[PDB]
From a paper:
DARPins are engineered proteins that consist of 4–5 structurally similar repeats that stack on top of each other, forming a compact protein domain. DARPins combine all potential advantages of single domain binders over antibodies: they are small in size (ca. 18 kDa), possess high biophysical stability, have very high expression yields in E. coli, can easily be genetically encoded for in vivo applications and are devoid of disulphides and hence well suited for applications where they are expressed in the reducing cytoplasm. Structural investigations showed that these DARPins bind to different but slightly overlapping epitopes.
To connect 3G124nc and either YKKD or YRLK we chose flexible GS-linkers. Therefore, two linkers of 7 and 11 aa named GS7 (GGGSGGG) and GS11 (GGGSGGGSGGG) were tested for linking 3G124nc with either YKKD or YRLK. The resulting four constructs were named gc_K7, gc_K11, gc_R7 and gc_R11 according to whether they contained YKKD or YRLK and the linker used was 7 or 11 aa long. The complexes crystallized under various conditions with different unit cells and one to four complexes per asymmetric unit (AU). All GFP-clamps form 1:1 complexes with eGFP, in which the clamp indeed wraps around approximately half the eGFP molecule and creates a continuous large interaction surface, similar to the superposition of the two parental DARPins on GFP (Fig. 4(a,b and c)). The buried surface area (BSA) of the GFP-clamp complexes is 1625 ± 72 Å2. Between 7 and 11 hydrogen bonds were found in the different structures. Hydrogen bonds of Trp79 from the GFP-clamp to Leu44 of eGFP, Trp79 to Leu220, Gln81 to Lys41, His114 to Gln204, Asp143 to Gln204, Asn156 to Arg73 and Phe226/230 (numbering for constructs with different linker lengths, respectively) to Asn198 seem to be the most crucial ones, since they are found in almost all complex structures. The structures of the GFP-clamps confirm the intended design: both DARPin-derived domains overlay well with the parental DARPins when superimposed on eGFP. Most interactions between the DARPins and eGFP are found in the single DARPin complexes as well as in the GFP-clamp complexes, confirming that both domains can bind their respective epitope without strain or steric hindrance.
Author numbering:
A (entry chain B): 1 to 64, 68 to 230
B (entry chain A): 9 to 310
Amino acid sequence: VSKGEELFTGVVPILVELDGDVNGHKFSVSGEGEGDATYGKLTLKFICTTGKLPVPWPTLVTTLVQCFSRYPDHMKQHDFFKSAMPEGYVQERTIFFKDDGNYKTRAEVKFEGDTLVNRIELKGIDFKEDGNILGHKLEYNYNSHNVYIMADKQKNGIKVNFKIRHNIEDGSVQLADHYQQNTPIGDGPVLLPDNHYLSTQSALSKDPNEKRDHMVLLEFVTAAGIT
Amino acid sequence: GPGSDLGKKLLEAARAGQDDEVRILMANGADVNAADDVGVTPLHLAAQRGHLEIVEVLLKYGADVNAADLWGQTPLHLAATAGHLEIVEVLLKNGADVNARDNIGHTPLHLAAWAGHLEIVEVLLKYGADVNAQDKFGKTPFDLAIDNGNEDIAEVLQKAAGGGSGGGSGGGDVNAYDEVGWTPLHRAAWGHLELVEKLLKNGADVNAADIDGYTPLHLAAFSGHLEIVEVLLKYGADVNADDQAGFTPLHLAAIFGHLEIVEVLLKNGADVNAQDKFGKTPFDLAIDNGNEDIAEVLQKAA
């Protein structure tokens, strides 16, 4: 057993807070729910607390806690995310939407008491008002992805790369190219992994009793690629 | 007010396994079908956390065995995931929908096969579970069993599908692919040398590209497995595969410092002038990543 690991042996409550600004449209999102890394499983619900969300909900999924990924026993030594806990890590991304604008995000993921909190600032720029994002042409659904993880020994963190595929209502696919880096908040030693991947599955839904703009999210994530 | 307060206490008592508290709260008017703001009921929690006696009393007094939370999960989904055999059986005896779907499309059989609970798999099959059910990503319970290395379950599930014995060693199609375009060979490329060899001998497509454009040779170079790279090339892997990937295997080897892989790729015809989607050659990337041995070799390769 290990320190950060042991914080995730059971169900953990989750709080997500996102402060956003896309092409000058300011918004805030709040989410809550639970994660269980034993199963790589998240059950979350998000609300746009400012009113209507100015971008499609699927474009925020990756921004809105990879410490809940299931790392199987033979891969425990490669789980950077939990090893940084409880003091946590900074997650930064640039997300390039093909033929459109980009998101830049900075999040702090850490424990506050017994709750795992993901606090995010998002800035979006150069989006086309008639594009798929500001034009709300993305289907309300989500695909399965492979997330590629590499150590950044020089910076005592990891680098993460992957391509998100967003289905467009006309049948095409909008590519969202993700560049990610994570760095521990604390000075304690962390696990720096060999190259590997995560396999993701998500489903988005709606709460029939919720009047606010919102997203219900079920997510399963498992690490693999080490023998 | 008073009722949802009692309902909340009952939710907490069922989650905690507090049998006496559950009795008292139910006697004092707590609704057995209390649901919080995300549709979770006492029966969900008792079933999830393994509290059989509470499951039984809740059912006795009219709890809805097929209640679904916002994520589509019924108590049977949670008990099947968690490995609670006796609760699974009690739920089915009380009319639980054996093929209920969560929002990803998982049936209880999916989840029990994923999580490695063989006796629960068998019980579900005996209550009519659909062995061919696919979730929204096309996965059957068999696929998830094999994805998580649950070979005994995979063997059982293949037979129940009418596919005969041998399922513990994988399906019938070496060239089957999932929604990310991964074939068995993509999965094996991450260090499973003996399986790579077996799959290629059994007709695996050595140059299959996934939804991102990656061939098994890319993945082997990314993960640093020299012997797998060698075997892939021996069976005809395209040494310069790019095609939507935006980089070749030689680019990956140069980034991550795999000198022997670089040399094997060069010996097999790798193109040193190939540019990735940022205009970088492997030599550029070796320089950028401080990989001196590799940069020397690539500079010598002209």
